């Protein structure tokens, strides 16, 4: 059995007093006119989903419904037996069908009636709102509006995915789910919420929320924007099976002197950077270009590894904006350098050692020696590798182990071409890119077209259909019927009338002309 939740499931979103005001807030509320499951206690204690939070309501005569169990495997136990409310988070053993008769991290001890509750779990806190009110109705939930107040807030840190109710045996109840919807809450003169608008229920509610009013005057209003959503994603990278020789840079037997640093070129390979970032062998791992955890999603036209030995106190000089004995004379980085500087202590590898010597960006100008000894930290040798990333939108050759997909065309998709992402429809192109051009650009510097990373063909990118959404309505004093115009779109992805102004849904197309009342556009009213 199921019922109509009507306007139930609203609560005071915070602990602030307000009056004579319409307040807009986004929180987990029961959607208006939602579908809620109807349970009975006649002649029924199932395990139900918790999802993002649960709306619970019950109608009582003899106080049969007394509690709930929340958790995963089914643990938070809430029971109201007589006058003593008991809340526990303990490793209690439950039955396959728990009921009442007519290791702990937390513990607390304190139809004729309608009892409403809201149960939501945010950042480890189990928040309970409630309201009690007298009723005179057996058949179903009463229709009407009331806002629930916060009562209990349990600092547990509990994972809740499912819950179960508790009945006393010798009382119907309803279960709904909360959604992150915006509501316009109407506070009367005494600060009581007396009404509410569900901003994602229908186009009239959207208009009421947009105008921050429970009354809408006759006319046409722009309340939202229509956007076609992607159905699937596309991940494209060159089909390269060779892996990048980072091990040959970092695990090298010997490193070069700082005055004569080595430069190893990395290309046409799969670059797994999780090894370098997660490894605990490094004393420092500072990125100036991109975050170290994004390295396996984005990719480069090339990577260069600059390998050399410095003193520990010289580590601070290998950075954009720095100056000094190394930064100015031995190894200079661009102040707009893109890349990561990785270094580690080599005291047990290099020290004895006078074979290491020191004296524009990336200049190798070919004189003093270092005295590296095992008993020296600031004067101990460090092995430093600088990974210079050319991340300009050129053909990529050095990309991480990101799983690829096939290519989907003539549909709205979420695409990734060599680390470049966006949403749009991929179509056939008659454009010809030069051999060195991987991406094209529009006036806004957005991607216009791409060369497919695996196939040497050009795809045009046409961002998914969108436009403003306007609600056409008579004043709410006469009617709550509305019609909706989807601006500058076809009657495709969206009693339908196609006009030059867009796709008009809900208005009847009439052959007889009339003096203009509510204008739509392009000769249509």
């Amino acid at each position: 059995a199921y019922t109509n939740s009507f306007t139930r499931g609203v609560y005071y979103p915070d602990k602030v007093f307000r009056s004579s005001v319409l307040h807009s807030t986004q929180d987990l509320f029961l959607p208006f006119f939602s579908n809620v499951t109807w349970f009975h206690a006649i002649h029924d204690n199932p395990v139900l989903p918790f999802n993002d939070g649960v709306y619970f309501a019950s109608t009582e005569k003899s106080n049969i419904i007394r509690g709930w169990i929340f958790g995963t495997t089914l643990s938070l136990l809430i029971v109201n037996n007589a006058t003593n409310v008991v809340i526990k988070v303990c490793e209690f053993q439950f039955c396959n069908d728990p009921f009442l008769g007519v290791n702990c991290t937390f513990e607390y001890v304190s139809f004729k009636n309608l009892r409403e509750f809201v149960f939501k779990n945010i950042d480890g806190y189990f928040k309970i709102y409630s309201k009690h009110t007298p009723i005179n109705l057996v058949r179903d939930l009463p229709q009407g509006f009331s806002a629930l107040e916060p009562l209990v807030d349990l600092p547990i840190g509990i994972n809740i995915t499912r819950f179960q109710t508790l009945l006393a045996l010798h009382a119907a109840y309803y279960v709904g789910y909360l959604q992150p919807r915006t509501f316009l809450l109407k506070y009367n003169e005494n600060g009581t919420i007396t009404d509410a608008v569900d901003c994602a229920l229908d186009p009239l509610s959207e208009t009421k929320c947009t105008l921050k009013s429970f009354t809408v005057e006759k006319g046409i209003y722009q309340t939202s924007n229509f956007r076609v959503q992607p159905t699937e994603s596309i991940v494209r990278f060159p089909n390269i099976t060779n892996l990048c020789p980072f091990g040959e840079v970092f695990n090298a037997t010997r490193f070069a002197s700082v005055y004569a640093w080595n430069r190893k070129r990395i290309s046409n390979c799969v670059a797994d950077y999780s090894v370098l970032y997660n490894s605990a062998s490094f004393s420092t791992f500072k990125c100036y270009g991109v975050s170290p955890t994004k390295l396996n999603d984005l990719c480069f036209t090339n990577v260069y590894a600059d390998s050399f030995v410095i003193r520990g106190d010289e580590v601070r000089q290998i950075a954009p904006g720095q100056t000094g004995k190394i930064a100015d004379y031995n190894y200079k980085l661009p102040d707009d350098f893109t890349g990561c500087v990785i270094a580690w202590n080599s005291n047990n590898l290099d020290s004895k050692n006078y074979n290491y010597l020191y004296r524009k960006p990336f200049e190798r100008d070919i004189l003093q020696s270092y005295g590296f000894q095992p008993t020296n930290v600031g004067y101990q040798p460090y092995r430093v590798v600088v990974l210079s990333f050319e991340l300009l939108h050129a053909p990529a050759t050095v990309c991480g182990p990101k799983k690829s997909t096939n290519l989907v065309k003539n549909k709205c998709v979420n695409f990734n071409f060599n680390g470049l992402t966006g949403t749009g429809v991929l179509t056939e192109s008659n454009k010809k890119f030069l051999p060195f051009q991987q991406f094209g650009r529009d006036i806004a510097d957005t991607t216009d077209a791409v060369r497919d990373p695996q196939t040497l063909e050009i795809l045009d990118i046409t961002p998914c259909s969108f436009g403003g959404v306007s609600v056409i309505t008579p004043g709410t004093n006469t009617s709550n019927q509305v019609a909706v115009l989807y601006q500058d779109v076809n009657c495709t992805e969206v009693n339908v009338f196609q006009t030059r102004a867009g796709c008009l849904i809900g208005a009847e197309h009439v052959n007889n002309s009339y003096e203009c009342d509510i204008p739509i556009g392009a000769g249509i009213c």
Partner: antibody
Amino acid sequence: VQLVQSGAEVKKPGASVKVSCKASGYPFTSYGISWVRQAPGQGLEWMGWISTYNGNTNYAQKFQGRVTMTTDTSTTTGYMELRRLRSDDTAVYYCARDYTRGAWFGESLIGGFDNWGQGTLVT
Amino acid sequence: IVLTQGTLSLSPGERATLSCRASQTVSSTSLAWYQQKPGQAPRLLIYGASSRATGIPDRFSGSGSGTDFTLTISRLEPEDFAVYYCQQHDTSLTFGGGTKVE
């Protein structure tokens, strides 16, 4: 990671032997292939090293001009052909995954012959 | 660079020291130690003179410099009765004679 090789063979002096090796569980082109021989009653002798990435091959002076190494990345295999055999060449020939020299750059690494196969006896 | 390492007689539970000497100084990061059980291929235990190879028990440890390096076993197991070899690989590839542990 596992390495497997061909079975045992018997050859007469002047003959050649083609010793094969197959491997799996790792990126083939990231690691080289090293060959080590062990004559009965003897210790280990290095014969050579081949890059699975670019064909760069190094040999022990003892086998320069006697051994030809080659790889095939499409089957994940490597081969070592020993020409102009002598009775002096009796040994078990072992194939190992190499992290002693870089597969891409040819430079020395900190590591060794990290994963050895069973080895094959050639008389 | 020729390496020199005949039979070490020790009971299970005793500490073993296995020596390797080079005719020339070698890089401290280019020494590897292997363990070969009879009838089996050798396996890598220690690399870079002192670093422990993946899958190798903590009872194995190495150290050294110049021309004098060692491999030690804190406590011998019945599974350690194998021939241990030292490998020099900074300048060409050389193996030592091999030390037998009983």
